[PDB]
């Protein structure tokens, strides 16, 4: 597992070099935007149960075949397993937001997941729909302009978007 700082260090060691000034300045830039990164993780975390629930209700209304007898989310054991999977993806995405790097997400979550769904009979394209719905909910909560000191968080919302998409691409 790396973070954005350790990333830069492991690259410089590969060629046996001290850091350039450009690199110190880019890492100083990271540290200065850190408050906003912290607001985003707290907001998304404090509403975790509602993000998952509403995305689930949405998917089953659009794709009602998933819950008909014979469906991949029919019976309470398969429904519970589906709900669990959503909670987990959302967790490893919040980890990667803190770290500022996708390595915790790729290495401990997405790696091998496509093959798992194909072996179980779970439709991967359906999962990717669920991820995309959690994304749009999360960005709205994090970038809500109320009850916070005003400023610009757009570069951060663009980075966040990236992590959700990456999870989506990996299952489909």
């Amino acid at each position: 597992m790396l973070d954005a700082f350790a990333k830069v260090v492991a690259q410089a060691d590969a060629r046996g070099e001290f850091l350039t000034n450009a690199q110190f300045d880019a890492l100083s830039n990271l540290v200065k935007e850190g408050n906003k990164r912290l607001d985003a993780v707290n907001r998304i975390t404090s509403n975790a149960s509602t993000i998952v629930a509403n995305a689930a209700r949405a998917l089953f209304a659009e794709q009602p075949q998933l819950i008909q007898p014979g469906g991949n989310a029919y019976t309470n054991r398969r429904m519970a397993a589906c709900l669990r999977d959503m909670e987990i993806i959302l967790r490893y995405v919040t980890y990667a937001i803190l770290a500022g790097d996708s390595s915790v997400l790729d290495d401990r979550c997405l790696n091998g997941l496509r093959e798992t769904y194909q072996a179980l009979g779970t439709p991967g394209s359906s999962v990717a729909v669920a991820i995309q719905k959690m994304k749009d909910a999360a960005i709205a909560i994090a970038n809500d302009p109320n009850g916070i000191t005003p400023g610009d968080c757009s570069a951060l919302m663009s980075e966040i978007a990236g992590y959700f998409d990456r999870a989506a691409a990996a299952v489909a």
Binding site: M1, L2, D3, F5, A6, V8, V9, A10, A12, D13, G16, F18, L19, F24, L27, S28, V31, G34, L38, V41, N42, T45, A48, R91, T94, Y95, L98, A99, V104, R108
Partner: protein
């Protein structure tokens, strides 16, 4: 790699949890301490060449026998002097990496695992490297909390050699 941010994730993930306030406080502490750590890493990087050149001469004055005895483990030949100066630079470079990451991770992975095997196998004395690190500590020219950051990592390496 061990940093204050990877430790926080590791505790949430180990117990199956989302991050909580308990963990966010840690990462802010890291972000606040970084102003001093960077001051130190830049200074050490800018003055690296005179620190390495002065550190090697301190070793040669303390243990004069390393510039006269015959053996590939010693600095009695031009190649041996070249290799000693390179090791001292490895040690300095790992201190700057620790400061940039906010913890011991880099020095743990790239240097301290395997250290006592390598020293025994090629007949290299710990005391030589401790002397060099003491010279850098005494002459880095830093003051205040930036000198505090630099010394905590230098002393970390001395303990591993003891």
């Amino acid at each position: 790699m061990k940093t204050p941010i990877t430790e926080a994730i590791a505790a949430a993930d180990t117990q199956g949890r989302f991050l909580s306030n308990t963990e966010l406080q840690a990462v802010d502490g890291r972000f606040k301490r970084a102003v001093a750590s960077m001051e130190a890493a830049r200074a050490l990087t800018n003055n690296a060449q005179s620190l390495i050149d002065g550190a090697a001469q301190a070793v040669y004055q303390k243990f004069p026998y390393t510039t006269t005895m015959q053996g590939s483990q010693y600095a009695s030949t031009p190649e041996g002097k070249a290799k000693c100066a390179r090791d001292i630079g490895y040690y300095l470079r790992m201190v700057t990496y620790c400061l940039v990451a906010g913890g011991t991770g880099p020095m743990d992975e790239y240097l301290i695992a395997g250290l006592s095997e390598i020293n025994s196998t090629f007949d290299l004395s710990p005391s030589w490297y401790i002397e060099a690190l003491k010279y850098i500590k005494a002459n880095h020219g830093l003051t205040g909390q930036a000198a505090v950051e630099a010394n905590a990592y230098i002393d970390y390496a001395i303990n591993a050699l003891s």
